[PDB]
Amino acid sequence: DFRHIVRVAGVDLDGNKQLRWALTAIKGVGINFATMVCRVAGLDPFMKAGYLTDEQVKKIEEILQDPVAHGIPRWAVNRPKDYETGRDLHLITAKLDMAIREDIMRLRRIRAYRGIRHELGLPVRGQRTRSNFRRGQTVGVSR
Amino acid sequence: VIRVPLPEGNQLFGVVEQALGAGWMDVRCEDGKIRRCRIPGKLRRRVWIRVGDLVIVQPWPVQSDKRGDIVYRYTQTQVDWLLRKGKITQEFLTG
Amino acid sequence: RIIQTTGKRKTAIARAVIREGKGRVRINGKPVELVEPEIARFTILEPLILAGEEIWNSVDIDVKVQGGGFMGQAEAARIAIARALVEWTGDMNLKEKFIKYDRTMLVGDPRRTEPHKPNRSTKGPRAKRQKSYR
Amino acid sequence: MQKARIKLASTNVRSLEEVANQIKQIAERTGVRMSGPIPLPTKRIRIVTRKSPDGEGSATFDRWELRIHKRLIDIEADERAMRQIMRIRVPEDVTIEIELI
Amino acid sequence: GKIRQGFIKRVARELFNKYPNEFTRDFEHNKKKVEELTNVTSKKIRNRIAGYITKLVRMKEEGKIL
Amino acid sequence: MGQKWKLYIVKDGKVIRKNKFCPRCGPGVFMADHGDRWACGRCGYTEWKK
Amino acid sequence: EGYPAEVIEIIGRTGTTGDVTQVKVRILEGRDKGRVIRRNVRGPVRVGDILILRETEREAREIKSRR
Amino acid sequence: ATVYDVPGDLLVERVAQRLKEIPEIKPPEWAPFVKTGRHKERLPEQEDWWYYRVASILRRVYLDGPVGIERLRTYYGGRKNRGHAPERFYKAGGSIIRKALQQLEAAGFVEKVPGKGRVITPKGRSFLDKIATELKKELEEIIPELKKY
Amino acid sequence: AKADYNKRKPRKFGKGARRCIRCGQYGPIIRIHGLMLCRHCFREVAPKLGFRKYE
Amino acid sequence: AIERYFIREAVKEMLIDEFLEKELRRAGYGGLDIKKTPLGTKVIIFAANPGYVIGRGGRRIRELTRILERQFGLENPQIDVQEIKNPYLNAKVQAVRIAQALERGIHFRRAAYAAMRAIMSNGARGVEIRISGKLTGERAKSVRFYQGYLAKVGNPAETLVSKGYAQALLKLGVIGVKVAIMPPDARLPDEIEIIEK
Amino acid sequence: MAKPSYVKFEVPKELAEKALQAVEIARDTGKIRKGTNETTKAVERGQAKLVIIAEDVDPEEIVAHLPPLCEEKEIPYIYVPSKKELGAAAGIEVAAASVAIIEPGKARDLVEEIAMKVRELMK
Amino acid sequence: KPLSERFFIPHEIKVMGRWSTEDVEVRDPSLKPYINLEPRLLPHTHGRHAKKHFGKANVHIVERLINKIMRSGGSHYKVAGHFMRREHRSLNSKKVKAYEVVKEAFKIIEKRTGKNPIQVLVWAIENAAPREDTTSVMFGGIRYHVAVDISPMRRLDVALRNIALGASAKCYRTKMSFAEALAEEIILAANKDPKSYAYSKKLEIERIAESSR
Amino acid sequence: RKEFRYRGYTLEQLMNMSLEELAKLLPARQRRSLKRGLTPEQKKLLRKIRLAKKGKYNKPIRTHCRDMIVLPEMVGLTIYVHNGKEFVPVEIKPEMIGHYLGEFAPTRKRVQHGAPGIGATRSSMFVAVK
RNA sequence: GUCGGGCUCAUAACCCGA
RNA sequence: GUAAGGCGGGGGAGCACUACAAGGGGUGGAGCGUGCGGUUUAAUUGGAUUCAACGCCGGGAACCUCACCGGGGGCGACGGCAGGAUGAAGGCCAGGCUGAAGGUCUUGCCGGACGCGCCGAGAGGAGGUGCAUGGCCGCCGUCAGCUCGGCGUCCACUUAAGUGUGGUAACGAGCGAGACCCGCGCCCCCAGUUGCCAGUCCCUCCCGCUCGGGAGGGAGGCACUCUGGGGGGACUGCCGGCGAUAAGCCGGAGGAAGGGGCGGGCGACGGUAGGUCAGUAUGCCCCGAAACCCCCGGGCUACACGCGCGCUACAAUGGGCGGGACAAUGGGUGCCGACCCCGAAAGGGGGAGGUAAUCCCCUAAACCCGCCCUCAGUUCGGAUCGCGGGCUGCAACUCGCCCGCGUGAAGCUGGAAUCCCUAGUACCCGCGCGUCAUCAUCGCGCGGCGAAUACGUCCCUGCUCCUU
Ligand SMILES: [Mg+2]
Ligand SMILES: [Mg+2]
Ligand SMILES: [Mg+2]
Ligand SMILES: [Mg+2]
Ligand SMILES: [Mg+2]
Ligand SMILES: [Mg+2]
Ligand SMILES: [Mg+2]
Ligand SMILES: [Mg+2]
Ligand SMILES: [Zn+2]
């Protein structure tokens, strides 16, 4: 009954790892958050992912669609207090990066100071730029 | 605005064609007449001139041909400063 | 009758007390049979293990140690225990064996750290920065 | 009774022992008990400061220090002794404090 | 180098050829008889004068003084 | 330095000062006549002139 | 392999930077067994040591008058 | 026998198992989603991590007198991995310790000294010393040197 | 009034809230155990306060 | 605590003394000492000519106490003038006397020789004067005079030699003076005698 | 106190003397309130004792303030011949109008004579 | 891990309480008075020797082995390829850890071979000690590199350092640990096997020393 | 996706909220700054924006206070902000509320680099000073 | 041959990398 | 021209981990913290450039600091002039200009003598000059020199040393070295609170049920530790061998300690036109209604690039989770905050005791035991960015610090070159003070754990003496 590749919520994940570490392959889940959803779905976080039957994948995917309505606190979600509505949302692989893209386009529309630094590709959180952050290539005077 | 040795009185601009040695430098002036400049005593110690750098000089009206005298020098900060205002034209350096 | 002695090792003072008994020895309340870093348990056992299963089973010792660290307290306890065992019994064929083996079990160690000087001053007296010509 | 408690403190350690000994005398000449001068830990204050006015040269420092010595005395409350300890004429750099317990 | 100092010798001689029978070959006797015959107020300085006097009394009592 | 001290509503036969006093200080110090309020002059009052 | 020798006298410090020492050794088994020769050693040496050497006929070049 | 006669961690392991019978000790319902301090990085891995912390706090006021919360936070602190900067010590949180002491107090094992902290009652001394004796009785079967005392 | 534009502002924290008692400068001021002096004025008047340089 | 009391009363003396230097430069200020009795203190000022410090019938002293009570602490001050104990062993005074003789117009080699002669007459062991400024030229110089024994390095030359410094402003610039004296009862450690019978 | 181009009455010389010479002696002893537009208010309160109003002010608008107001107070006053002497009697060197004072010290006999003279004479 | 081995109580003065140095035998007459094999229950002397000339002669050999692995590796000389700069995760002043790895090495050596572990170590530190070398000599003006002889104390020091460094490379970024890489080095040296590091270094020293006689 | 909503509230809806029920919908910085009150200069600026909003003050609004927090009273009008030398027009739109006022007026000019000069490398230092 | 870094108080000569 | 002896790729002797030799750890290659040169700007304020410039000017700058850029507004003791009690200098309710302002103006009141519209002078100046000075400081150098009433100060040997002993046209001296001062390690006397608890005695509680063992209080005592005033102890003194038998040097006993006992303070006559006029003092030259004094907003925090000093790593000589162990220096009234309650955390509300051996900061980390990971760009590494919650402050966008969830860059051991260290030292690990309203990858100190090698040479890099 063992399976070598299981597919849960989009991406398919390994079958010879501990369930808590196979769920990290999803972009939008870390190790602190995967432990929570294994403890809420009610199954051990040390079992090998390949032993997941179908009902358990269904429960996991359900918990991934609204974590607050199942027991996860609301200080432990991906983005709390959504900008369009005051809900508490946790987003994953394909809809997470679209949110960040729109969050940067908003700052670029009004021409804020933090959206222009995104335009130019320069440091945004106030670092110093004389000695580090050197991504370009050398220049000379003469030899 | 700025403290630059622009033309003040009877000034000239020095762009040397060749150094023969012994204090004589020959400049390719827009005049056409080859001016053979010399050196005073105050600049032969603290500053240091070479070939190809625009400098300032003072001529003497004697024949208005072989004359000239440096009294101050130009930096690298100013060589391209004296171009945007159009005070001097660069094409006489390349033609 | 009872006796009491002293031992010191780099900011670690130890006070021991000996008397007639059954053979049990406690250090701060812990029996020496239960001390975890074995390299520290074998240090406080030599003065006893070198005197035999005979003198060991006629005394009760208890040491009060404070200061220093887990290895600077074991040697303080050892000095205290040897200095006490050499007085209770009062025989010198035992003081002989305590000096062929280790002379400091009975005279002590006078070494302390050295004040640091100013070039880094937070690394040591003689550690300095890194020179740089050019 | 009432075990008055005198507390001296000073920087010159020589100019302290003589006041302590005056009090020791005054107690001995009379009939009254006294707890000998109890030494409390010295309180040295220390200040490190760079030695040059500008910033050139290697950096070398100073270590200035000021030490302050303290004592403690208990004594029974007798007018024959209290009166005598009131004309004792402390020197200038000696600070004295009395308070009944 | 444990070189003897200049004023140690200069006094250790001056009070050995002035009282040439008041110093024996013993160290601890000299140390006392030195502290009372001079105004030395240090302690490392009377130890060294006592040592030099001992070395003088053991050389002049055996033979050739140099 | 010119001359300006007049128009106190003062005549001959009798005198009736035009601007009243400032209650804050005693008598003597007069009032202002801006046209909407009575301004002290050096005290502090905006009682909306009577 | 190798015949041993016993160090009985030191002569001083040779070496381009003061590292080797010249000594006088006495062989004690093999073809010679008793001849006294001179050799150079690298390291700290006492009297009474026992070196292990592999040639027994080299006779280190004499030192500059020991001084 | 007392708790001075045995190794501490084997005792804590044995005491935690007994603590699962007192119906007053039960983990708060925000326990599956927390870590124990700002100096840690990941959440506790064993499922009964509550019982170990409680049973370590009980043995902790037994042999350290009247003690309060802000001193049990310095014991349960540690070193931090704060990125590119050098390591540094920090205290621990408070709720995990406060709930533990309140639940122990409701069990009867500790109590409150007015203005000094918390002590252990005769009932708690009985509880710990009995288990310590039960542990030592089976630790003389392998080290026959603990027989003496 | 013309007496409102030569008058300072009363800071109470910052480098401009403490100045040397003897020189009058802002910056490197010792504030240990009360004393309030430049690091330059202390070093030249410490022997008269009673400090000594033992070690 | 207590150290804050011990070093709050050492700064008041320092400020009062440093003000009195400037104020009483002439007539030769020597030094002071405060005595704190109940209900008030007692200030003593060892000048060298009480005539200038007291005033005309004592009208300078009124101003002095008014300042010493308003601009400094000293809730109830009482001044009285004195005379220096030994003016020729107090280098901090000879520095000022040489400085004044300079800025009055005397050559810088008569001043120093006269001063050294007086100090070594009144019974000192040895003296050292060092005058360094723009004397005789436009480039600075420095000269040095000395007479007898004088320790320089070590603990005995930190407690036994008395030393002072003073400026002598002139028409061209300043000139620094530095004097140092060793009193006639010194006794270095090097000096031992044989207590004989 | 208007210009002499105002026929109020005649002016004698004795009161002039013993009232213009009444100021210096009262100046070295009291508190002086010079000028006109200053003590108009003090006499509005009525505190100034011996006011001394002259006849020199021109033009005739700011000139008659007290003669309309003398009829409501006690106004112990005189008339003054000219101005320079009034500036010299107290204060400064300008053309003065009414140098009124309070508390004439040592100068009360002249008060009792000529002040009550001018009181009983006219008002 | 078994409590009978976690709480260990010795009753006798043997080295580390487990093995006895009575029938070990130093065959080499040169390295006889420098290999110390006296009773010495515990091997830790708190560095009281490195103050007197020729002092480290009376220090038990097991302790010299323990002191010479409290290092990081090769920090200014490449050893078998690379540098081995291990900062902040080296056992530079941790003696407890070095003591444990030497104890575990000895427990593995006693099992694969079946002999007293110190007999094997004393065999190994004689096959790794070289007896010829090379240096320079200044004389009249020039130099030229020659052959010299090695004194026995230096032989012992070089042998021990070479065993330490040879064992300290087989455990670098490899699946093998350090307690067992320290046993695989000793077992291999005492067999005069080429795969060693300490034995090969003696061969390559003696060879290029003979080349220049 | 056509109207602007901040937390589910439209503009004219979040416009008549008070200053304490709104600050629950702002980030932590803005809430704390609104809770310690407006500084007197921001009070003089708000006193002048509420005139320009009702009927009066047809005259360009200028300010130095780069710390003002864009609030739903200021949506529509164009104010000028001092960037160190000039007053820069910053028209206020929804999606600006919450942000600081200086966040839309830059203070340093963009740097477009030239060519290294003498001393820029270790090969041009000692061959040029003579 | 070109840019960059090393060695020297600094330039030449010399060593290394792109 | 802005104040008319030393050296030599010569010879001897002697030294030093900022020299080598024998060793331990690294830097140089990747990312970031910070200082510098250079480019950019309205300004990105200045000084320092081999050792001896570059976490240096105690320089961790949000306002102030501040010297820089854009704007606004103030100040001439004192002499003598225009004018001035018919009222000089000066102050304000409301409203305009304004970033905001009785600063100016509209509007009318007030105060009672002076008077920058004028002339001379004067305060004040982080304005020039450190190449006009004083004071202070770094380097030759803690080297052995520099001189007085060419020699003496040279030669042989000796010393850390111009430190000593002999021979000497030399004999006597001074300052520097030494002596001197502060700590550390061993023993004794006097002291016993706020420090200490061993032996006796009362009282309560717990365990194998108590014969034994343990834990807290109060009665008592200075026994031990400690605190700090005074004393002792070590002198080449004793034994053996070199050297003359003298100066001295090697080895050993006894000793807590051994050959300046170990670690620090104190830097001669002079030079370096070395640094500082931007710590204070000061001559000359310049600004003097401005280069002086204040207030608002920007800047020193910009970023194709070359360099210095560091922090974190490239994994098993480890990462994570849960348990268990042991310090010292210092600081506290504008401040330290035990103890109870609220929160998941940062944090929030009450609040004893402390002006100090009395109460607080203050149950350190590396280390040990159990389980998961198994050589992989990973359960290594933690830059970079999104959303949300807090603290200090009059003010956090430029441009502060802290917390939770998410994202997951280069990096798989480093070319030529090059630095620091000789014993409780170097390496590894955390802590306290300074600066401080808030902010430590820094300076200065503290303890924890604890080695390898050599007791030597003048080969390289330097310095001191005699000679040529
Ligand atoms: Mg080159
Ligand atoms: Mg600023
Ligand atoms: Mg200079
Ligand atoms: Mg010299
Ligand atoms: Mg210069
Ligand atoms: Mg800066
Ligand atoms: Mg990780
Ligand atoms: Mg900010
Ligand atoms: Zn100052």
mmCIF file of C-alpha atoms in Angstrom, chain J residues 61-158:
data_model
loop_
_atom_site.group_PDB
_atom_site.id
_atom_site.type_symbol
_atom_site.label_atom_id
_atom_site.label_comp_id
_atom_site.label_asym_id
_atom_site.label_seq_id
_atom_site.Cartn_x
_atom_site.Cartn_y
_atom_site.Cartn_z
ATOM 1 C CA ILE J 61 36.181 91.305 50.323
ATOM 2 C CA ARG J 62 32.485 92.185 50.293
ATOM 3 C CA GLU J 63 32.346 91.545 46.547
ATOM 4 C CA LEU J 64 34.434 88.390 46.896
ATOM 5 C CA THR J 65 32.087 86.839 49.453
ATOM 6 C CA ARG J 66 29.029 87.915 47.487
ATOM 7 C CA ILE J 67 30.342 86.032 44.459
ATOM 8 C CA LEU J 68 31.551 83.065 46.502
ATOM 9 C CA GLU J 69 28.040 82.690 47.939
ATOM 10 C CA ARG J 70 25.990 83.428 44.826
ATOM 11 C CA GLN J 71 28.007 82.035 41.893
ATOM 12 C CA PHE J 72 29.277 79.036 43.883
ATOM 13 C CA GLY J 73 27.918 77.162 46.899
ATOM 14 C CA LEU J 74 29.264 78.047 50.355
ATOM 15 C CA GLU J 75 26.026 78.937 52.094
ATOM 16 C CA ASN J 76 27.795 81.120 54.718
ATOM 17 C CA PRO J 77 31.342 82.141 53.775
ATOM 18 C CA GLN J 78 33.975 83.956 55.820
ATOM 19 C CA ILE J 79 37.249 84.938 54.182
ATOM 20 C CA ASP J 80 40.440 86.044 55.856
ATOM 21 C CA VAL J 81 43.799 86.628 54.256
ATOM 22 C CA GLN J 82 47.137 85.150 55.303
ATOM 23 C CA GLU J 83 50.770 85.152 54.146
ATOM 24 C CA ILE J 84 52.561 82.386 52.246
ATOM 25 C CA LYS J 85 54.393 79.876 54.409
ATOM 26 C CA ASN J 86 57.580 79.688 52.306
ATOM 27 C CA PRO J 87 57.279 81.695 49.073
ATOM 28 C CA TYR J 88 60.544 80.342 47.640
ATOM 29 C CA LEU J 89 59.672 76.631 47.807
ATOM 30 C CA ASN J 90 56.338 77.028 46.027
ATOM 31 C CA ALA J 91 57.113 76.683 42.335
ATOM 32 C CA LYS J 92 53.533 77.585 41.416
ATOM 33 C CA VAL J 93 54.353 81.112 42.590
ATOM 34 C CA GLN J 94 57.818 81.540 41.099
ATOM 35 C CA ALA J 95 56.350 80.685 37.714
ATOM 36 C CA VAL J 96 54.012 83.678 37.956
ATOM 37 C CA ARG J 97 56.686 86.002 39.318
ATOM 38 C CA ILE J 98 59.037 85.179 36.443
ATOM 39 C CA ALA J 99 56.174 85.490 33.957
ATOM 40 C CA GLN J 100 55.316 88.963 35.240
ATOM 41 C CA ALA J 101 58.931 90.121 35.267
ATOM 42 C CA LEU J 102 59.056 88.981 31.644
ATOM 43 C CA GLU J 103 55.917 90.725 30.448
ATOM 44 C CA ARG J 104 57.170 93.907 32.088
ATOM 45 C CA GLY J 105 60.110 94.026 29.683
ATOM 46 C CA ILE J 106 63.173 92.363 31.209
ATOM 47 C CA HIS J 107 65.464 90.103 29.207
ATOM 48 C CA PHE J 108 64.716 86.408 29.546
ATOM 49 C CA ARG J 109 68.169 85.576 30.928
ATOM 50 C CA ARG J 110 68.234 88.052 33.799
ATOM 51 C CA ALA J 111 64.855 86.902 35.068
ATOM 52 C CA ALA J 112 65.818 83.230 35.206
ATOM 53 C CA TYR J 113 69.249 83.776 36.753
ATOM 54 C CA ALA J 114 67.883 86.063 39.471
ATOM 55 C CA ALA J 115 65.085 83.614 40.289
ATOM 56 C CA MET J 116 67.387 80.612 40.471
ATOM 57 C CA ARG J 117 69.757 82.561 42.700
ATOM 58 C CA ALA J 118 66.988 83.463 45.134
ATOM 59 C CA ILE J 119 65.558 79.951 45.315
ATOM 60 C CA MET J 120 68.947 78.309 45.809
ATOM 61 C CA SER J 121 69.875 80.927 48.404
ATOM 62 C CA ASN J 122 66.801 80.338 50.561
ATOM 63 C CA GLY J 123 67.907 76.739 50.926
ATOM 64 C CA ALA J 124 66.653 74.338 48.262
ATOM 65 C CA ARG J 125 68.402 71.263 46.930
ATOM 66 C CA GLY J 126 67.963 72.040 43.231
ATOM 67 C CA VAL J 127 65.792 73.850 40.674
ATOM 68 C CA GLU J 128 64.910 73.643 36.988
ATOM 69 C CA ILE J 129 63.495 76.460 34.845
ATOM 70 C CA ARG J 130 62.485 75.996 31.205
ATOM 71 C CA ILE J 131 61.467 79.035 29.125
ATOM 72 C CA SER J 132 60.190 78.248 25.648
ATOM 73 C CA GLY J 133 58.517 80.636 23.255
ATOM 74 C CA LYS J 134 59.201 83.051 20.426
ATOM 75 C CA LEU J 135 62.036 84.858 22.180
ATOM 76 C CA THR J 136 64.650 86.551 19.946
ATOM 77 C CA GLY J 137 63.335 85.689 16.515
ATOM 78 C CA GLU J 138 60.401 84.505 14.456
ATOM 79 C CA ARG J 139 61.072 80.789 14.947
ATOM 80 C CA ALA J 140 60.443 79.267 18.342
ATOM 81 C CA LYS J 141 63.259 78.098 20.586
ATOM 82 C CA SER J 142 63.668 76.734 24.116
ATOM 83 C CA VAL J 143 66.308 77.151 26.813
ATOM 84 C CA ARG J 144 66.875 75.427 30.149
ATOM 85 C CA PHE J 145 68.553 76.304 33.468
ATOM 86 C CA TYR J 146 69.291 74.125 36.512
ATOM 87 C CA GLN J 147 71.454 74.145 39.660
ATOM 88 C CA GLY J 148 71.535 71.005 41.792
ATOM 89 C CA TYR J 149 69.898 67.655 42.489
ATOM 90 C CA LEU J 150 66.447 67.103 41.005
ATOM 91 C CA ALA J 151 64.641 63.815 40.464
ATOM 92 C CA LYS J 152 62.657 63.399 37.274
ATOM 93 C CA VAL J 153 61.432 59.806 36.915
ATOM 94 C CA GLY J 154 59.902 57.426 39.423
ATOM 95 C CA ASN J 155 57.709 57.741 42.475
ATOM 96 C CA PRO J 156 60.026 60.141 44.365
ATOM 97 C CA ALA J 157 59.693 62.556 41.441
ATOM 98 C CA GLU J 158 55.925 62.553 41.790
#
